[PDB]
C-alpha cells in the first residue's frame, strides 16, 4: 500500500543536486538561483554543534557542485539566508516558472516531488502535522524535495526538506529558510512529541485492509470515546474526537462496519500483539495515509 504516485508536473525542471564535500542533496533551480538546505556544507562532525556563520567563510564558489543531469551549472556566487544556502550560478533555467514563496499552516494540503538519488520520482500529496513534522516514506533519503501549490499559471512554493527525525519524521523550512516548528539544521534530540500515533489515520488504513480482502481483526466488542481514549492514551495515539468520527463517515458506509466496532477491532490489535499476521502485507499499524489517501480505494 502507498500514497499515489502522481506525475512530476512542472517543477520536474527545477530540480537539481548540489554537492558540498561528500554530501549531496537535491537543490531548487528558479531563474539564475539555487536553492538547497545550508546544512550540505557540514559534515558528519559539523553537524553536531555548528557555526554557519564561520563554516561558509572556509568556503567559495568552488565547494559546490550544482548537477542538472549530466549538466553542470557553474557557481558565480553564493550566501546564506537563514536555513537556506543560495547559490548564484552562470545561466537562467529556462524552465522556470511563474512563482511566488509563501509560508503556510499544518492541515493545508500541497504538493512534493519526490526523488531518489536526485531522480524526480513523481509528486506525492501530503500536509504538515500539527506539530509541524510530515509523515511520508516517500521522504525517506529525499533531502532538499521542495513542497508547493499549482494555482492556476502560479507554482507557490511553501516548504523544503531539511531533516528525517530517528522516529520516521520529517521536518522542513519554507521557501525562506525558516523552519516550520521548533527544529533546528544541527543533529539533537529534537524527536519528542514526534512519535505519538494518529489515530485517524491507522482507522482509515484499517478501513482500507476491510475493502481489500484483510479482515480478521474484526471483533464483536463495543468501546465508547471515552473507553477506547484510555487505551489511546496508555498506547501514545492521539485522542480520538467526534470530527475524526465524522471524516470516517463515507468510509464506514462503504465497508458497513460502524467506526466504534473498528475501534474495537484497534483496542484489542493494541493490547494483544499481532502474532506476525499481516494488515495489507504489513506487520506494524500504519499512520501515514490520510483519510483522503483512502478516498483512492
Known amino acids: 500500500f502507498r500514497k499515489m504516485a502522481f506525475p512530476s508536473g512542472k517543477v520536474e525542471g527545477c ?24 546544512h550540505v556544507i557540514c559534515t558528519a562532525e559539523d553537524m553536531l554543534n555548528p557555526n554557519y556563520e ?20 557553474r557557481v558565480i556566487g553564493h550566501s546564506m539566508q537563514n536555513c537556506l544556502l543560495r547559490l548564484k550560478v552562470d545561466t537562467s533555467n529556462p524552465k522556470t516558472p511563474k512563482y511566488k514563496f509563501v509560508r503556510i499552516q499544518p492541515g493545508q494540503t500541497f504538493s512534493v516531488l519526490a526523488c531518489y538519488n536526485g531522480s524526480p520520482s513523481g509528486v506525492y500529496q501530503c500536509a504538515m502535522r500539527p ?23 502560479c507554482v507557490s512554493f511553501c516548504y523544503m526538506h531539511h531533516m528525517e527525525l530517528p522516529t520516521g519524521v520529517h521536518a522542513g523550512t519554507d521557501l525562506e529558510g525558516k523552519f516550520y516548528g521548533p527544529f533546528v539544521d544541527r543533529q539533537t ?3 519528542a512529541g514526534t ?19 484483510d479482515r480478521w481483526f474484526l471483533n464483536r466488542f463495543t468501546t465508547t470515546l471515552n473507553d477506547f481514549n484510555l487505551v489511546a492514551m496508555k498506547y501514545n495515539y492521539e485522542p480520538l ?57
Open 189 to 191: 534530540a529534537q524527536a
Open 54 to 73: 564561520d563554516l561558509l567563510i572556509r568556503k567559495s564558489n568552488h565547494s559546490f557542485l550544482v548537477q542538472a543531469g549530466n549538466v553542470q551549472l
Open 131 to 153: 506539530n509541524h513534522t510530515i509523515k511520508g516514506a516517500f521522504l525517506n533519503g529525499s533531502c532538499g524535495s521542495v513542497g508547493f501549490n499549482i494555482d492556476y499559471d
Open 241 to 297: 474526537t467526534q470530527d475524526h468520527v465524522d471524516i470516517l463517515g463515507p468510509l464506514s458506509a462503504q465497508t458497513g462496519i460502524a467506526v466504534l466496532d473498528m475501534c474495537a477491532a484497534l483496542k484489542e490489535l493494541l493490547q494483544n500483539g499481532m502474532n506476525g499476521r499481516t494488515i495489507l502485507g504489513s506487520t506494524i499499524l500504519e499512520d501515514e495515509f490520510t483519510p483522503f489517501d483512502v478516498v483512492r480505494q
Open 195 to 213: 512519535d505519538t500515533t494518529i489515530t485517524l489515520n491507522v482507522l482509515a488504513w484499517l478501513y482500507a485492509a476491510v475493502i481489500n480482502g
Open 15 to 38: 530540480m537539481v543536486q548540489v554537492t558540498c564535500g561528500t554530501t549531496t542533496l537535491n537543490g531548487l533551480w528558479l531563474d539564475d538561483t539555487v536553492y538547497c538546505p545550508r
